[PDB]
Design a protein around this nucleic acid. Sequence first.
RNA 1: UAGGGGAUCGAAGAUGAUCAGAUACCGUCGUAGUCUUAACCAUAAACUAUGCCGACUAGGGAUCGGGUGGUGUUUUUUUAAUGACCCACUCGGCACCUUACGAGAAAUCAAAGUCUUUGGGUUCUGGGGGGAGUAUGGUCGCAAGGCUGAAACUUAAAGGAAUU
RNA 2: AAAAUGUAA
Lengths: 60, 129, 25, 120, 206, 87, 97, 217, 96
Amino acid sequence: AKVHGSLARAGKVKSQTPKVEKTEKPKKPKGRAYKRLLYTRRFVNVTLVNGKRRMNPGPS
Amino acid sequence: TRSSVLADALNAINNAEKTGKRQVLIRPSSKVIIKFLQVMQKHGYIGEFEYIDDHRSGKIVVQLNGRLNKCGVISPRFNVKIGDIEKWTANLLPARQFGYVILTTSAGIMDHEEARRKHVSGKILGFVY
Amino acid sequence: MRAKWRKKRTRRLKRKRRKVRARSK
Amino acid sequence: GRVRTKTVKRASKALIERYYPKLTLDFQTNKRLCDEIATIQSKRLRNKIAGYTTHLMKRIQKGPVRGISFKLQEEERERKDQYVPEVSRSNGVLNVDNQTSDLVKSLGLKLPLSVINVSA
Amino acid sequence: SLPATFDLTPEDAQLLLAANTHLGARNVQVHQEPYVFNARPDGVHVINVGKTWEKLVLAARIIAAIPNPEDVVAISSRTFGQRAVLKFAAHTGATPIAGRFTPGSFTNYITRSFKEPRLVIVTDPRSDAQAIKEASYVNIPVIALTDLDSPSEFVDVAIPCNNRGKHSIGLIWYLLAREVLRLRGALVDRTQPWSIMPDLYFYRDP
Amino acid sequence: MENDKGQLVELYVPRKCSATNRIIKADDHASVQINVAKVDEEGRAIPGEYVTYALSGYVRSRGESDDSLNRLAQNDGLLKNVWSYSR
Amino acid sequence: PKKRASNGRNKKGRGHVKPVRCVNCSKSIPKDKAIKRMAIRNIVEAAAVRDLSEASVYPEYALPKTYNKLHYCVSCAIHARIVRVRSREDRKNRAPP
Amino acid sequence: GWVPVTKLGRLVKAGKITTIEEIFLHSLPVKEFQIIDTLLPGLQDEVMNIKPVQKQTRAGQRTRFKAVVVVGDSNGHVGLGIKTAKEVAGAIRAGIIIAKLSVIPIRRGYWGTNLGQPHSLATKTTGKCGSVTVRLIPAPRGSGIVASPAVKKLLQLAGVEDVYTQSNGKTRTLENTLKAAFVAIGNTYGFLTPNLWAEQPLPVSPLDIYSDEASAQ
Amino acid sequence: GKGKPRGLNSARKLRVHRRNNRWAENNYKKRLLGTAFKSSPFGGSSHAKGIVLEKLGIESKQPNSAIRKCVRVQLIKNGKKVTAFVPNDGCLNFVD
RNA sequence: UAGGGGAUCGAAGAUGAUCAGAUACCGUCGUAGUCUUAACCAUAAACUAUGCCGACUAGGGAUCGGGUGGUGUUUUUUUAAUGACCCACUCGGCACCUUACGAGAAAUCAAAGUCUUUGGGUUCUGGGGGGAGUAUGGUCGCAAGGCUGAAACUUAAAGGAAUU
RNA sequence: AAAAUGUAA
């Protein structure tokens, strides 16, 4: 095999990608308040009785 | 050669129920095998037997029904310490309500629950159901 | 391949290195 | 090749088993007989049905036909079921051995005894 | 249980000798058939006529023991006993299937050959091995007319007959009908000759 | 099969073989029950008077339904002699 | 895997046989594990037979025959000889026809 | 639109037998699926998994769909539905029909006591398939269905609560794992137990006394 | 028996063959043979340290076609020159 | 190894063709050899790829040895007598046929059965495949080799039966 | 009688 190749691409694609950041997202409670929202958002008023279950659906 | 005589009598009996026999024949029979025939007979597993007397060892034609399924032996003769009885019931016994493990004690050849009342112990023979 | 030929390979190869070790005695 | 298929033997068979008290070995009548009882589609098609049945009519006039009947022949079967007019219990009574002799000695009556030789 | 006069009879037994149903087999004799009355030398055997009447009267207790006398299958592989099976279902009202049997007469309810039986009857248990498996997948009684050669696989009653052919098949089914009427039927006593003819059964040529 | 306060618990009761004392379960498509009508005076088998016999699926797979047949029939009185036990 | 309870052609009861020679290629083949057929023919063909009783003397002559045994090596019996092989259940057949 | 065939199917459409226990009692087999539904209204579903089975041709390939579905309820009734159809949808509908034709009852009592309400199993029973042995051991109340994910939901719709299971061989196969469990519960009534060593009268068949109304037209 | 002695006094026979069959284990062998105490870049440790000898560019194999981008190391407690794998995207600018 | 013998076939080798090449496959000659005496060597798809003894679960026919019966036959001089064959039966056998409710991955096998319904007694070996039956030491052998028998390193497959 | 071979698509 090749013992001596090319190392010019040390972080090539890493920096040649566009510069987009994180905006200040809505606050999410910590602990007990968080699991309160999972119990309803999956069981109570449910998500969607379409086939089965989706928490991360599609473009529809 | 012929080592465990009790295991050989049970041999012809294993395939006897696998066919639906109403009779069986053992050989050459010992004193130990005699008191075991009474064990199953005592609870209602098998029927009564008839020991034919000859000038050699002996032979017994036991008339079985169809209640008995598996009759085996435990080789060799093992040492029990009272705690072995409460562990062996879950070692091979089909249930916790029915089934008997016969062994040899000083007062006779009986099972764990009967030996329970008299706190007796010794070696081991086989399993019954 | 045929392992009969693999046993002929090692046969002469051990005998070869046998006389080469005798050159040091 | 020129060989009859499914719909040919199938249709020729139906007509003969329900309308047998008719038919002949003629083509112009068996062809127009298909036009008098049932209904078809084309003419060429109808012509093939009629030709195969005149072939079958020729084998029916020779006694039994393979695979076909209509109850009329089961009564005809009872008539020719008695043959022989002579018989083959006449010659003697019972032809036996030495071994078959001891057989009658244990159970029978109207079966006499006669000895043979036999070489094993 | 025993009837009344349904025991040993001189007239019934001498008619079985005019049938050749006492003649045994040859080199062959299947384990489960030790029903002999003297071993006939030269490679032959004999059949006990009294124990053969027993087999016929017993399976007949199971014949008239079926609700509707029409769901009784009368199968025949032998061409010799084809008119004989037609006459049995002609006096009781059962269903005869002589000639081509066809796989799907007990199973495959889609066909016009399918009939749900409560009693099954076979002529030759050897060649009819197909009708044997049919009844063994639906829980139904199986009858077979064996000799000494035919294996009694999956059958209940194996009567000692003469499946070699000839007049043995027509003799068996003749007395079978006389019994389905003696016990609940249009029969009267034991001194009953029966107007029916045995020469209507048997094989007729061509 | 009961409990502390008596009562018959655990639904469904399977049958049993009268020749092998071997329980008759539903997965057996080869077990046959005999219906031998009991005849009396002037014949008459009676439409409701039968004798039941149990011959399992394994018995038929060997053809042994004929052995215990004479056995089970002889002792009840329908088989005058015919079979012999002592062999 | 193993397709015949005899593997080749029998080998139960002994454990060694004298190998003979093929007649076509002459390849050494075990005695019992070889193929040998009966060549129970006549001296000539089905035509020159009456031509012989024409030139020969005596009344009608006699007309002799010639018997032989052909030894093959399996490879020879297939090139166009006693073979044509068989199917799964048809291989167990042991009748000459 | 049901209207079945045979004496069996017509005596069920007549209401002479409302219990499936009469079926299993005389060991009589099943032929129609709609009949097992007139006796069992509470039949629920539970699809396990589908695996496309391929077959080669002179042209290329041709794969089907091996749907592994089961039926039954929380009592003692279960169903075995094996189907291989052209589509996934057809294998679901026709696979349920097959699961009705193979319905069998199960046995299970207590671990070792006798109080009330069968909670565990009865005896040590087992079923094999190919190279997969599945032994069933009785367990005390409060535990759970101890086995694989598939055999666990299988016994859920079997009516049992407590159980232990020990396997030997290659078990990563849905087919043979669950086909051997269909065998283990079938042998529940195939092993003689003392509390069932009394001789039964063995009643006369329903299609004998009712064989008068379902015969013909 | 089925290939074994159910003998009361043959307790040592069972012990003899057992130890010899344990040598067939890849885990038992390496354990009692002290493979790390002999060779193996890690002698009884899970963590170690070395010094960069040089910067390499080793590639990959099948069913692929690309480069791995690597480097070289050297044992301190031993003195054995080795080779390591550089994780993440790039970061070769922080090694040296 | 050493003597004797040494027809035939025939590792090597020779050789005419054959192929693109032919130191192979085809032909022909022929050293050792193939045989025997006295020593060796000690491995074989040395296999029933199935260790040794013990018991039971099967319908049957062949068939070698001994055994018992048959008012069976042949030999004839003469009923004989044996000897030969036939038939019933039988142990030790050499195998087979149809199934196997059994077991088995399947092919299959009355054993490879009596294994989760888990134990008759007992011997030896393997534990993914390679590396590699290779190394070092030892040990027998005239030599060749035999016996015991590694490590470093490598890889996610090797492999077995079976259907299209 | 003679008649070999298969680049990353």
